[PDB]
Design a binder for this molecule. Sequence first.
Ligand SMILES: [Zn+2]
Length: 143
Amino acid sequence: MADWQKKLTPEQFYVTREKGTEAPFSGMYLNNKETGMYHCVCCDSPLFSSEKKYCSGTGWPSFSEAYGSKGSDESHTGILRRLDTSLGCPRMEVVCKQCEAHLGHVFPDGPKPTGQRFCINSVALKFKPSKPAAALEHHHHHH
Ligand SMILES: [Zn+2]
């Protein structure tokens, strides 16, 4: 509103359309994509490793697990969850409670739930890479 910028490059209105599709002329998506992780820009916490990114199929924003934490960590994470099988067919969906970010979901492909695909949408999420000269996480300094 009151603009041309946000109309030519929408954000909250764009990612909500990308919540179902791939696109050609991918540009910045036509090169390599490194290892790393993803975190909120709404709360505090890093939550998903790019290590589980569905590469060598589509490279698209999916995560073959929500990978970094286990068992003990299901209270620590500040993430929550909600299942739905009520249309006669089972779905699984997940939220961060810290940010209230309801952005991660996992759906079957037709066979057993062993074939599932876990899609996550970046509408309030940022990322940090694995490799240095863009990773620089701890201090490097002296006396
Ligand atoms: Zn969060």
